[PDB]
């Protein structure tokens, strides 16, 4: 075929040398002779039969890699028309080429895909002067809608573009321009698209579906004999496609979720693409974030069989996506989400009203429905009990009957609050069914749905963490203050961040998975609250409200004290808060934390690792605050002392661990943000007093009594001395 093209080019040159308007025809409508057949068939596309398309497909496929640009463009147009008309054959050919046993074949398949991508915009001009009225091409059927305002910045403008036309001051302006150019990435923008001065596109669903094999070939390390690897070509092609227009690249994948249950694979492929490319350009990240949020919104609004599962799957990845979106701010996020009535699903600080009532149907269709008023503290257990009493079920089948939602496929766990799941106060109350089920089947469904919901909550927390970490050095304090006030005004913040499914942990089936998710969620909540704390002013005027945020830490240490990861995360974050909020924790604060640590230390006496970690944390506390910390420790152990409760011997064990240096077995210090050789945060206590003698503790208690003998704190310290 290359010989044929060279022969045709030589004939064209000979004809040119033979010769007015004929030269114009030669240079404007011949331009070569090789594409004359293909460009003919493109002109007869409406009248081509399916057999003709199948027969022309292999030729147009092979001719895509021509040096001649006209031949390549005509072949691309013809193959795009074939994919429009015979998607099955085109898809089979694409899969055979992408999974071909020869390295050269796969590399050529990726290169041909790139040529198709280039000539995507040059199909209608080659087709016919009156087409696109005939030869109807199905438009991309978009099902969901993006958020009404775009969440992030559409793209980051390149600093000082060469294609945009515009002495200390001159020198500083030149330095500023140089720094801006060095800070702006030119490989992450469509260079030729933006450099052209100022038109539909043909790219059917099979050609878009070809991106998945290219994503997989991004990892295909097979090297051609010319030294070119398939992975490099695939990465370059996909990078250029995502740079130019990510919408067409991701159209197929985004539509497939609404089309069918394919979320567990869409998220897998998106994660694979992100990992192999290693980043996300601003436009790509913006588009992907908006489409994922719109998908969550769609599955919230349209009742679908796999809607909750798709929402969980997309929440498992939106946190990775959001780390690259540019110009996304928490206030705009809240505004758009509460405009869209979808804030609860991706913002862990939502604050929706509730339902205030709901209608529960009976098992029988002729049964008269019941209506239960919903209050803030009502859980589905009370509603189920009332429904069982109402619909005349004589306690013979009390575990057979489950509250269920049919519009949204939901079976309600008893210990879940009604307003958490039905948060909107719309005119129409939720409608439930008293579905009779075999108890094991009902419990299996409840376990599965609770696991999915917990994974959604994990994703929400991770999304918020990534959003906070993306925020620049400026706007950090504003964002943190917004988070703190949102948590405070949230009526169910500590309960949401601290609760657990104790009725579901005991099940030998699907019980341990929930426990693993719970440990992950508690660790994530600790990390999120530490992120909020570090970013607030160090001298923030606190009160009794700090407990509301510290109880979560304590909660995480009640459920999972023996988990080493959770234990060292707790110790690291408590040390970070003691260092950061130094003034608060030099007078108070330890009183919000120490009683829980003492209770855990006394409870798990048989666990030497937990006791060692608690003793190391207390040693670090004494290093930071020396005498105030000991006084707060005694004040927080005095109520717990007994003559269950913290014993009088475990307190002495903690003190004896304080006096002697303890090794860090769990590497707690490596997670401390201010990781230095820890010193006394007060200069007055600055001294080589690393040793905390028990005699010093006795002197401290004696002094607290001597200060005010009749104080209540005096009798607390007297009890501590007596112990």
């Amino acid at each position: 075929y290359l010989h044929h093209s060279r022969s045709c080019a030589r004939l064209v040159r000979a004809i040119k040398l033979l010769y007015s308007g004929m030269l114009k025809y030669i240079r404007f409508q011949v331009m070569s002779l090789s594409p004359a057949p293909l460009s003919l068939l493109i002109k007869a596309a409406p009248i081509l039969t399916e057999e003709m398309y199948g027969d022309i497909q292999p030729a147009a496929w092979e001719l895509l890699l021509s040096m001649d640009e006209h031949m390549a463009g005509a072949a691309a147009a013809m193959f795009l028309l074939c994919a429009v008309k015979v998607p099955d054959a085109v898809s089979d050919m694409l899969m055979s080429e992408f999974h071909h046993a020869e390295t050269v074949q796969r590399l050529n398949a990726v290169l041909k895909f790139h040529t198709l991508w280039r000539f995507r915009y040059q199909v209608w001009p080659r087709m016919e002067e009156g087409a696109q009225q005939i030869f109807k091409i199905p438009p991309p059927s978009i099902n969901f809608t993006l958020p009404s305002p775009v969440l992030g910045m559409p793209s980051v403008p390149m600093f000082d573009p060469p294609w945009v036309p515009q002495l200390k001051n001159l020198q500083q302006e030149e330095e500023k321009k140089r720094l801006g150019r060095e800070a702006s990435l030119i490989t992450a923008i469509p260079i030729t698209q933006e450099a052209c001065y100022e038109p539909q596109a043909v790219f059917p669903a099979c050609i878009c579906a070809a991106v998945l094999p290219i994503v997989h070939l991004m990892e295909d390390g097979e090297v051609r004999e010319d030294g070119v690897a398939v992975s490099a070509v695939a990465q370059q092609v996909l990078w250029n496609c995502l740079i130019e227009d990510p919408s067409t690249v991701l159209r197929h994948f985004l539509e497939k979720l609404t089309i069918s249950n394919r979320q567990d694979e869409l998220m897998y492929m998106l994660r694979k693409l992100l990992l192999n490319i290693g980043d996300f350009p601003a436009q790509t990240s913006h588009i992907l974030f908006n489409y994922l949020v719109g998908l969550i919104m769609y599955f919230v609004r349209t009742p679908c069989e796999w809607g909750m599962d798709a929402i969980s799957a997309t929440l498992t990845f939106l946190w990775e996506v959001v780390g690259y979106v540019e110009g996304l701010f928490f206030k705009d996020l809240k505004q758009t989400m509460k405009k869209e009535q979808c804030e609860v699903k991706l913002l862990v600080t939502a604050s929706m009203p509730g339902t205030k009532t709901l209608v529960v149907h009976g098992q029988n269709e002729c049964d008269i429905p019941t209506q239960l008023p919903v209050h803030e503290d009502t859980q589905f257990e009370a509603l189920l009990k009332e429904c069982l009493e109402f619909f005349n079920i004589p306690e013979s089948q009390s575990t057979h009957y489950f509250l269920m939602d049919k519009r949204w496929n939901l079976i309600h766990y008893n210990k879940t609050y009604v307003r958490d799941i039905y948060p909107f106060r719309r005119s129409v109350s939720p409608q439930l069914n008293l579905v009779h089920m075999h108890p094991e089947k009902g419990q299996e469904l409840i376990q599965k749905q609770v696991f999915t919901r917990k994974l959604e909550e994990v994703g929400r927390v991770l999304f918020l963490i990534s959003l906070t970490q993306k925020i620049p050095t400026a706007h950090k304090q504003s964002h943190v203050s917004m988070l703190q006030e949102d948590l405070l005004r949230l009526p169910s913040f500590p309960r949401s961040a601290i609760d657990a499914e104790f009725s579901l942990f005991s099940d030998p089936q699907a019980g341990k998975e929930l426990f693993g998710l719970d440990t992950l969620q508690k660790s994530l909540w600790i990390q999120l609250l530490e992120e909020m704390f570090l970013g607030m002013p160090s001298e923030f005027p606190w009160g009794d409200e700090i407990m509301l945020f510290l109880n979560v830490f304590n909660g995480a240490l009640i459920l999972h004290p023996e988990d080493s990861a959770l234990l060292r995360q707790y110790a690291a974050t408590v040390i970070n808060t003691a260092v950061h909020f130094n003034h608060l924790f030099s007078l108070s604060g330890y009183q919000w934390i120490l009683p829980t640590m003492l209770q855990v230390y006394s409870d798990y006496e048989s666990n030497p690792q937990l006791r060692r970690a608690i003793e190391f944390a207390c040693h670090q506390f004494y290093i930071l605050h020396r005498k105030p910390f000991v006084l707060q420790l005694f004040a927080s152990v005095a109520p717990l002392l007994e003559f269950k409760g913290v014993s009088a011997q475990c307190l002495f064990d903690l003190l004896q661990s304080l006096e002697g240096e303890t090794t860090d077995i769990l590497d707690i210090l490596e997670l401390v943000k201010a990781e230095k050789p820890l010193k006394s945060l007060d200069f007055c206590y600055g001294n080589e007093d690393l040793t905390f003698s028990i005699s010093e503790a006795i002197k401290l208690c004696v002094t607290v009594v001597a200060y005010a003998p009749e104080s209540f704190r005096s009798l607390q310290m007297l009890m501590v001395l007596e112990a």
């Binding site: 009526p491 500590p494 309960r495 601290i498 609760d499 657990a500 104790f502 009794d544 409200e545 407990m547 509301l548 109880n551 304590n554 909660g555 009640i558 459920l559």
Partner: peptide
């Protein structure tokens, strides 16, 4: 955990 939750509820009620 229920004791912690009740303490939190009382704290919110007081505020």
């Amino acid at each position: 955990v229920t004791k912690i939750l009740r303490a939190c509820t009382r704290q919110r009620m007081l505020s």
